[PDB]
Paper text:
Luminal peroxisomal proteins are imported from the cytosol by mobile receptors, which then recycle back to the cytosol by a poorly understood process. Recycling requires receptor modification by a membrane-embedded ubiquitin ligase complex comprising three RING finger domain-containing proteins (Pex2, Pex10 and Pex12). Here we report a cryo-electron microscopy structure of the ligase complex, which together with biochemical and in vivo experiments reveals its function as a retrotranslocation channel for peroxisomal import receptors. We propose that the N terminus of a recycling receptor is inserted from the peroxisomal lumen into the pore and monoubiquitylated by RF2 to enable extraction into the cytosol.
RF12 deviates even more from canonical ring fingers. It contains only five, instead of seven, conserved Cys residues, and lacks the second Zn2+ atom, as seen in both the cryo-EM structure and a crystal structure of the S. cerevisiae homologue that we determined at 1.5 Å resolution. RF12 is therefore not predicted to interact with an E2 enzyme. RF10 has some low activity, whereas both RF2 and RF12 are inactive (lane 4 and Extended Data Fig. 8a). RF12 is an activator of RF10, as it greatly stimulated the polyubiquitylation by RF10 (lane 5), in agreement with previous results. Mutation of L398 considerably reduced the stimulatory effect of RF12 in the in vitro assay. Thus, RF10 and RF12 probably function as a unit in polyubiquitylation.
Author numbering: 2 to 74
């Protein structure tokens, strides 16, 4: 089922803390989702799909997450 918070985080492999949903529907820790997308040029840690919601910042020469991460309460 979508949105479950009891699966391993696909980034850090631990119990998810501060869950959020990625553009691909998978759940990760909030800082894990942010850091993975920034560090991997906007690619999903589960599917390696190039995500629509990540944008390249020409000033910092780094990727940022503009849309596509949603927190779970
Ligand atoms: Zn994590």
């Amino acid at each position: 089922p979508l949105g479950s918070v009891s699966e391993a985080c696909p980034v850090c492999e631990k119990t998810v803390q501060n869950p959020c949903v990625l553009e691909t529907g998978y759940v990760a820790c909030y800082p894990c989702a942010i850091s993975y997308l920034v560090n991997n040029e906007g690619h999903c840690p589960v599917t390696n799909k190039k995500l629509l919601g990540c944008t390249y910042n020409k000033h910092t020469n780094k990727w940022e997450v503009v849309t596509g991460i949603r927190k779970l309460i």
